[PDB]
Design a protein around this ligand. Structure first.
Ligand code: HEM
Ligand code: HEM
Ligand code: JI7
Ligand code: JI7
Ligand code: H4B
Ligand code: H4B
Ligand code: ZN
Lengths: 409, 411
């Protein structure tokens, strides 16, 4: 009932009480832990409870719990739900809600930043064009000439499931993927299928290796339309090493704005199916996963051949040597072009400070260890030795079916 | 009920039916996951069912389930339990059990070697000196002049819990730790407390950076006794780098045999409180954890200075760079001295193969991702991209409180 988490590097212990407000399920049982499984319409009766829970905590946060203002709103919404069968969040509730869905993102290591989120209320949007306008502005605001700023743009909430707003891209910015005759894959393998639906819809693919994919926006349930983010708005960084001049010849570049666009924001029972949100990269995301993942740009072998390493035997640890370089480059290039980026050492350290704050100010902090520990140098970052408790709190960011596997054209 | 796991690097999907035999708890609930949590005397009453389940698996393994031998055994064991309150395993069952405890160790990446296990039956042992001889023979056999062999020595099972046999050391071989009055620590910090106990028990500590600790053995619930392992039996490997000739001057070395001695082996309800077991290392255990954990030898800074990396800012990834070289050095030194060891690429690759085989032939392979994933380069090893199901089966290796916290001294 009162759990305690220990850090085996500093012996420090924190007591978690926040997990007791855990609403949703985890996918685990007393017999089986699914901690490493990537992915373990509402009704009026279902909705008022969700709303009440949200509203109670919202008023609690502003120190007006059980006040008239609180009750008043609690009834206003209640009546609205009974009459309309859904409801609208007040601007204040929308912000609090979005900031808190991030606060609860148990897989996000950079939450120490959670309170500083620019929310763009896009609920008055009605068309794919209006969606394109908002997103552009979003990109521009957050990119901010390289000095990145966290932001999220929130489109209308779901109603009957047939008028859903959705951004089809997994991220606002991503390179395309084409399966060539060579049997090989050109570009980013992760987006092969998407890059095809763009062609299937009209895109004029430059069939290059780093073509910024086009936005496929879906409004009010209609069919998605295509748009090409203004090139001047997509800030990119060419990748070079601070010692290996031959590096630049790999012709590697990556975009500065990480912006997740396929998730579903849930606040007080309400569902926001289109809510792109962005921050800034942690070195490893690009250098370790995007570049080295075997099923992504898989550049290890190449960077190895160029380093003149004994790739004859695994035990020489050449992959480990290449990996550290590739990641030194990323952090290097970005810091040079003055684009925001944080390294895995500094990021994990910040998350530790954040965890203590959350434990002593909120009573805990849900955290998914499998995701928090960077994909490289694991045990040399503090979070490796930090025990974590994982539970689901709402408001939240949830996953949702890729739209193409559901859209009734 | 079937459960499926997917590999996100190869899109391979496996189905688990084995978890359906999982009895013990996990620490998790539908509301909370404790996957990253380190550590979440029986009655005649609760013993026979446990004895029964075990013998059923045993007999099925030899394809004699329901045979006359099987039923008589079950009847024999029942009788023995009603009569003595416990029961003795047959040599064949003890060996089957130990192998399966290993096979079921979800935190072990080396499980592909599970069937090749040398089981030493030390159930006839009665004193600490008796234990010392046994442990010495295991160390010699297991070391095999550098060509390591997996082995486990099994002493008498617990009876009334007042006569436990325990090996106080956490590992058969390990360096001492000394706390200095100036706050710093000499040797391995992880063993400072245990070292104090040894000194207190009469150990003349040579106070060096790499002093092999003495064995503190407890037999039949009596007070533990000290023994020094024959130096000529402790295979050690001095650490040097292939390209850096200054590495050797760092003064590092490490013992060649990893042998966990503080776990409890549970087979068919019976509890084996003293059951040392050993195999061979994966580079990273020494190179990443033992050497680089801040709470261990913490050698990252000194290895950084010598290589002259930009240590002013973390983004130069100096710490990451040094690390690779330190692990390269550990692997290198062991291969040069012909002492068995395996790198993490090689070890995880084999586990995936082992794991797959276990699904096809067993219906599952319980695995703890948090522990299976190596402490460095996680994503460039196939296990990182592999979903895993963690659950408990017996026979099994469990944790038990350190004996100094529970032992009732006799003076
Ligand atoms: C500004 C600094 C930020 C940093 C350094 C950061 C870093 C990270 C990292 C390392 C991950 C794992 C990424 C992966 O492996 O796919 C992650 C995931 C996530 N982050 Fe953050 N983040 C930041 C901002 C944000 C913002 C502004 C939000 C939301 C408002 C957010 C929401 C999440 C969520 C929901 C996940 C999990 C999404 C998924 O499954 O891919 N993050 N973050
Ligand atoms: C053949 C060589 C072997 C290799 C390379 C291998 C490797 C490993 C590694 C890397 C770990 C995690 C180490 C740590 O962080 O503490 C581990 C844990 C473990 N291994 Fe193995 N293993 C081997 C043999 C064995 C044997 C022979 C047994 C049992 C008969 C065994 C039982 C276990 C168990 C029970 C754990 C968990 C230890 C704990 O939870 O404290 N291993 N193994
Ligand atoms: C705001 C933000 C900031 C920041 N720094 N990083 C992120 C993370 C996103 C950008 N880098 C990768 C991740 N998006 C991909 C998440 N999906 C992972 C995945 C892979 C296969 C299947 C599934 Cl279901 C999910 C988001
Ligand atoms: C047979 C075997 C083979 C092999 N290759 N490796 C091991 C693993 C042991 C040798 N490397 C470290 C580990 N020791 C036991 C792990 N316990 C860690 C610990 C420390 C402090 C507190 C806790 Cl709770 C746990 C065992
Ligand atoms: C199979 C396993 O769940 C999967 O590879 C996870 C592991 N940890 C991760 N951690 C982060 N941050 N991001 C990921 O995409 C993953 N993938
Ligand atoms: C707190 C956290 O669970 C702890 O640091 C774990 C993580 N994974 C590990 N994995 C292995 N193999 N060995 C360990 O000692 C640990 N420590
Ligand atoms: Zn779990």
């Amino acid at each position: 009932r009162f759990l305690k988490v220990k850090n085996w590097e500093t012996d420090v212990v924190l007591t978690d009480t926040l997990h007791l407000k855990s609403t949703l399920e985890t996918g685990c049982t007393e017999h089986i832990c699914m901690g490493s499984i990537m992915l373990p319409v509402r009704t009026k009766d279902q909705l008022f409870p969700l709303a009440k829970e949200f509203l109670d905590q919202y008023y609690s946060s502003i120190k007006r719990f059980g006040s008239k203002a609180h009750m008043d709103r609690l009834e206003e919404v209640n009546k609205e739900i009974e009459s309309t069968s859904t409801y609208q969040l007040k601007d204040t509730e929308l912000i609090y809600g979005a900031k808190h869905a991030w606060r609860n993102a148990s897989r996000c290591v950079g939450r120490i930043q959670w309170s500083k989120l620019q929310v763009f209320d896009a609920r008055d949007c009605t068309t794919a064009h209006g969606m394109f306008n908002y997103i552009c502005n979003h990109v521009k605001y957050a990119t901010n000439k390289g000095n990145l700023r966290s932001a999220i743009t929130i489109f209308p909430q779901r109603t009957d499931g047939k008028h859903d707003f959705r951004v089809w891209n997994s991220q606002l910015i991503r390179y395309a993927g084409y399966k060539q005759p060579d049997g090989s894959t050109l570009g980013d393998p992760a987006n092969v299928q998407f890059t095809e639906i763009c062609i299937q819809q009209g895109w004029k693919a430059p069939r290059g290796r780093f073509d910024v994919l086009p936005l496929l926006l879906q409004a009010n349930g209609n069919d998605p339309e295509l748009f090409q983010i203004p090139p001047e708005l997509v800030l990119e960084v060419p990748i070079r090493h601070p010692k290996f001049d031959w590096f630049k010849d790999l012709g590697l570049k990556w975009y500065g704005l990480p912006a997740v666009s396929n998730m579903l924001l849930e606040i007080g029972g309400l569902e926001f199916s289109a809510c792109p949100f962005s921050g800034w990269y942690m070195g490893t995301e690009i250098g370790v996963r995007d570049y080295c993942d075997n099923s992504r740009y898989n550049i290890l072998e190449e960077v190895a051949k160029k380093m003149d390493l004994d790739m004859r035997k695994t035990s020489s640890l050449w992959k480990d040597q290449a990996l550290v370089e590739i990641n030194i480059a990323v952090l290097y290039s970005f810091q040079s072009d003055k684009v925001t980026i944080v390294d895995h050492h500094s990021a994990t350290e910040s998350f530790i400070k954040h965890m203590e704050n959350e434990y002593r100010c909120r009573g805990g902090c849900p955290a998914d260890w499998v995701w928090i520990v960077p994909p490289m140098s694991g045990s040399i970052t503090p979070v490796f030795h930090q025990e974590m408790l994982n539970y689901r709190l709402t408001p939240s960011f949830e996953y949702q079916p890729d739209p193409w596997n559901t859209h009734v054209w």
